[PDB]
Amino acid sequence: MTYWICITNRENWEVIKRHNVWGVPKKHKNTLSRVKPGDKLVIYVRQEKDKEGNLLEPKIVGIYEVTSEPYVDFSRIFKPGGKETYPYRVKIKPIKIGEINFKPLINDLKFIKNKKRWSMHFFGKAMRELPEEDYKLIEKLLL
């Protein structure tokens, strides 16, 4: 098996939730090739600003299970300034849906080596493998 944390934002999270699809750009197709049916996905939305200008901190919004082998589909379901379609995809199904702030978990997450500059572990990543302990920690807090 394999646990993963997928990095997106709130607008794309809504699409993910509606279409039961996790997609990535070509540059990250390599990572997706390792994904298998049954793998677990922790959905993460990065820090953003609402229209009003208010700060929306990062947080985990759900957990899904992969149900398909990776495939390619250029359908325009997502939304980038650019025109990326995130054609490299795997079908998924929801295990649990609930939101919890991410920051408070940083100290307890094993994959985050540098607590100071944790962004480092997210930088230029679409998704990354999570150690089992980390997954369980999140699973519990999201029950």
Environment class of residue 84 by beta-carbon count within 10 Å: exposed (0-12), middle (13-18) or buried (19+)? middle
CB atoms within 10 A of CB 88: 23
d(CA 98, CA 100): 7
User: What are the distances in angstroms from CA 122 to CA 3, 17, 95, 102, 117?
Assistant: 15, 22, 23, 13, 10
d(CA 83, CA 128): 23
d(CA 21, CA 115): 31
Tell me which method was used to determine the 3D structure.
Answer: X-ray
Structure tokens at 122: 């997210």
CB atoms within 10 A of CB 36: 13
Q: Which domain holds residue 73?
A: 1-143
d(CA 42, CA 71): 20
Contacts of 31 (CB under 8 A, 6+ apart): 24, 126, 127, 128
- How does strand 59-66 pair with strand 55-56? unpaired
Q: How many domains does the chain fold into?
A: 1
Stated resolution in angstroms: 2.0
Task: Give the 3-state secondary structure of 6-28.
Answer: EEECHHHHHHHHHHCEEEECHHH
Smallest CA-to-CA distance from 60 within 39, 40, 43 is with: 43
DSSP letters of the chain?
A: --EEEEEE-HHHHHHHHHHTEEEE-GGGHHHHTT--TT-EEEEEE--EE-TTS-EE--EEEEEEEE-S--EE-----S---------EEEEEEEEEEEEEESGGGTTT-TT---STTGGGGTTT-SEEEE-HHHHHHHHHHT-
CB 54 within 8 A of CB 68: no
CA dihedral of 118, 125, 102, 71, whole degrees rounded to 10? -160
Q: Whats the size of the chain, residue-wise?
A: 143
The domain that holds 2 is classified in CATH as 3.10.590.10
Using alpha carbons only, what angle is made at residue 30 by residues 81 and 68, rounded to the nearest 5 degrees? Answer: 90
